[PDB]
Symmetry: C3
Subunit: 259 residues, 3 copies
């Protein structure tokens, strides 16, 4: 399609013919960019970047930049894996992984607003949003349809479950459970992400089954272990609820408590 | 005056002869820039930008960029209206409106510090300051001489009154009343912006009349409705106080409570 | 070594032969850059910048930019003094001083993460870290090995002592004492920076002597003045403890209280 004459693209970089690269953009070697991707002006794509189809990179976005980890050996070919249909706004910055078997990974249809940051070794699934100036520390994992507000600190090694929301001015130290909204410092689960769930087309029955799972877990005067047991012993559960139980069971750091 | 040879300026863009544009800056079509305006390096001015006189745009500032709204039709010619004598610091980012009859609007002599952000459909008057990294969400309205600190979240559709201040680490959910200082999360009016008022040359009588209006509204053990009534029934009021009453009366979301 | 043909370097600027300057970077006059320094792409180095050896400036870093102070006379040749082995990440921004005898000063081996900001007239010593999006207001002083988290506001004229840490979502209004960790809004000393101290190779005896100094100062039911007196009257103290006492004695704004 069109690479501006002022763009600096390493000859070894692999770009589909349709790829558009704007003025004063820099693309390094060991880069692959797939069909339909548009790179605007002053964008930098660093060595190790593997980018899918129909992605947009707005002015000044920087992709696959060195980890902000002082002990990292800068000589290593580490990677940034990006899927399809993602939007990287102005001056957003995605950092590569710290090990050869540990890329920074982004799936599909994610939206990274202006000046948002994804730290080394983060794994994000699909359809997530980081709002303006949002920062994700290294080693943070997002599922799908998660929402990260600006002015949020997430502790390394935390997981954020599907359809969850972290509101602004929050400090996250343990996992954010799916379908939930976390707020405050120190942060707590304050309720369900009803908007995300309605917007997603969850049926009233599905939303009420999610509400019922968390009533047992949080609002029944019993320990988390006791509550998960109660839920499993109650019969056939829907997938969303099985997922809730499994998220709690699989938690490394433990799961954020309820207000 | 001087457009650097490396600047990329659409032939349809309307620039007064005196306009200075620095190295590697991009100016699109449907742009008008008036006398005395200086654009530094790596600045981007997007289609729909209408810029007045004696404005300064520092390195990497981006003006009229797409709204960060997923439902917005990117095909529309929407606008960013900027008046005179404004300063846009390094990597500040001003987003255009979402409708043809709904520009993002900035008046005169405003100061946008490094990496500050103005969301789609914001309206700002004159002489406002957003400090370093300050973010205004879409649909936020500032009057004149308002002060927005970094680490502040303002809810969409909030109004910030004249000479008011929002201190750092604050979450604003209802209107910020004029001549006042708002702080905390959840935020409250904590007192009057006495510095802004003194700096502005408000007489002791004017400042005391403002203090007296808020004593009735906040510190008299009555409802807001009762208090505004009391004030109007008390005789001839100065303009500043009439404005206070009207601000409370005209509030869409309601006005932030007092600590 | 290599200055890219597209770099714009004022002929009066003094660069050691080994200095590497990347694509579309701007270096102004009244600049001096010493041996081993690498400047990446789109970097701006402003007049008054005096840079030492083996510094790295990542893409879009801006150095010696005008103070964000409205009363500052932009005609003055004010300075930014940077030592050796510092790292300035992507879109970090260092502002120059406001007086001819008042530079912004950075020592050695400091790390400024992406989009971090150093205000006019800050003085930083050696080995400090500002994390992603960290902002230091004008006139803030850091010693050595201090750690500044993102989402922190530090009041002008505050000192941050050696090996201290300010955690995220904190508002600093008085001095941060050495070897300590400050947290919250309003902020308090919450404990000792044991990690910084262990990482630094402080002996168990040295760390326990520091803990003992603060037990007297904070946890003995007496005033700060009384406590410092008690410590000095207790005999021969190690340097780290003498420093603690002196930091408290020399405090302009006073020192942050303990939780």
């Amino acid at each position: 399609m069109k690479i501006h004459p002022t763009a600096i693209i390493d000859p070894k970089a692999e770009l589909h013919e349709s790829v558009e690269v704007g003025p004063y953009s820099i693309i390094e070697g060991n880069v692959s960019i797939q069909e339909g991707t548009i790179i605007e002006g002053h964008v930098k794509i660093c060595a190790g970047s593997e980018i899918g189809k129909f992605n947009r990179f707005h002015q000044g976005a920087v992709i696959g930049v060195m980890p902000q980890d002082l002990g990292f050996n800068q000589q290593l070919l580490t990677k940034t894996v990006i899927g399809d249909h993602n939007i990287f706004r102005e001056y957003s910055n995605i950092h590569k992984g710290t090990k050869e078997d540990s890329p920074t990974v982004i799936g599909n249809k994610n939206y990274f607003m202006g000046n948002s940051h994804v730290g080394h070794d983060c794994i994000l699934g699909n359809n997530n949003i980081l709002t303006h100036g949002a920062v994700l520390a290294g080693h943070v994992t997002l599922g799908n349809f998660a929402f990260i507000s600006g002015l949020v600190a997430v502790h390394q090694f935390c997981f954020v479950g599907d359809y969850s929301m972290v509101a602004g001015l929050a400090k996250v130290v343990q996992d954010v459970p799916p379908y939930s909204t976390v707020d405050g410092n120190p942060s707590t689960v304050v309720g369900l992400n009803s908007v995300g769930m309605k917007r997603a087309g969850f049926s009233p029955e599905v939303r009420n089954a999610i509400k019922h799972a968390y009533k047992v877990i949080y609002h029944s005067g019993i320990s988390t272990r006791k509550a998960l047991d109660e839920l499993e012993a109650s019969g056939n559960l829907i997938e969303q609820v099985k997922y809730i139980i499994k998220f709690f069971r699989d938690s490394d750091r433990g799961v954020t408590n309820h207000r």
